[PDB]
């Protein structure tokens, strides 16, 4: 019982925004990925520090709240003011909308940028279940799971065993080409024993 991000987000994840949730002989582990979560946080921050920036233009009074001005000039002031009110109110609602979409789509981008990294790591040693997880076709102890997180997994070390546990019939497993040395071979105990060794005995 374990799932990924194609379905739902984990609520137990609190060291960061993205992480690995694994499962093996020793049990479940939930540990955040630090590089990916900082890359998301540091771009949302980049938005804030661009919109929080202040304006340094100072406007003075042209109206007069205590002592009203000429009806014409006042009406034109009111007309300009209410027209400017409309522009900023529009420019504001839109900016929040765009930046909220770019924010939401920003975090989705960094989840996949991490998923598609772990994919290339495991090379030909795991498969995509389809729900944001990787069925690993080789025994992976708690030390091996941490090798996936800190980008040290070596596909070579487990490749040959993983592909054989993947390309199967019934138990089974593909077999190597018997030596091309000129002598016919027969299969016995997972090794190509030579046929000449079965034709030099005696009859009964």
């Amino acid at each position, epitope marked *: 019982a374990i799932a990924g991000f194609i379905e739902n987000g984990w609520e137990g994840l609190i*060291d*960061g925004w993205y992480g690995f949730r694994h499962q093996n002989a020793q049990g479940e582990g939930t540990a955040a990925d630090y590089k990916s979560t900082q890359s998301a946080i*540091d771009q*949302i921050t980049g938005k804030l*520090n661009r919109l929080i*920036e202040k304006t340094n233009q100072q406007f003075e009074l042209i109206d007069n709240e205590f002592n009203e001005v000429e009806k014409q000039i006042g009406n034109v002031i009111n007309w300009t003011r209410d027209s400017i009110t409309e522009v900023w109110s529009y420019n504001a609602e839109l900016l929040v909308a765009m930046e909220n979409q770019h924010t939401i789509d920003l975090a989705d981008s960094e989840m996949d940028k991490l998923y598609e990294r772990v994919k290339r790591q495991l090379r030909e040693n795991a498969e995509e279940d389809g729900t944001g997880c990787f069925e690993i076709f080789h025994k992976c102890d708690d030390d091996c799971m941490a090798s996936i997180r800190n980008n040290t997994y070596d596909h070579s070390k487990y490749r040959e065993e993983a592909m054989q546990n993947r390309i199967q019939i019934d138990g089974s497993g593909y077999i190597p080409e018997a030596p091309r040395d000129g002598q016919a071979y027969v299969r016995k105990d997972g090794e190509w024993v030579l046929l000449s060794t079965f034709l030099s005995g005696r009859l009964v």
Partner: antibody
Amino acid sequence: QVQLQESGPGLVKPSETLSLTCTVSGASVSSYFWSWIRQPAGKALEWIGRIYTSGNTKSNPSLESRVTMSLDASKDQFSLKLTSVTAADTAVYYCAAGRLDYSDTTGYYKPPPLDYWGQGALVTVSS
Amino acid sequence: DVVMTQSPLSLPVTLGQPASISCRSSQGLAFLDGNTYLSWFQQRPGQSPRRLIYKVSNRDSGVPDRFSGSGSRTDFTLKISRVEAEDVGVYYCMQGTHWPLTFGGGTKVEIKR
């Protein structure tokens, strides 16, 4: 009611492993961010790195190649190891602590606060 | 790296007069949680530095009234209402929003008595 006490060699030879250790009085190491700040003789404060229990030795790039931090929860001591030491690493080495709120998910991705400081240890790097 | 620039770099004041210290950051210092993490630090003769102001304006407990922090997002100012003989020392500003923590150059305050 918390105090941080630095300890370690007063001089380390060039290219050695400068080691120091901040011993915590009256608090649990589990509940803080732990920073090492060094101050060379009459220069700006330099922030080395920060760790917290469950691991995450986020460090400054100038020294990351050489820095190594760990902290023991039974002995209550932040520790530090600077490999291949130079005359530039001659400095006062204050250690510092900062509040750690477990639920502040966004707090592990921000430089830790510098709530408490130690007395500072002098490590002069010569032969 | 966020660049903390303080001014002045030597601030000799007259015992009992006010003064200010400006700290300009190369970047905005806002964070997702809505707080901008600038701090002010006072390192007096032969001592560990202690924190006067955290989060631009909040003064730390156990600090004289005359220390009040202020600032926006790039431009910040530490204000001392009334510098007495006990405020001698060096004053730093640090950003605490961006990796890595960085400190200002420092301002040397010396009392004119």
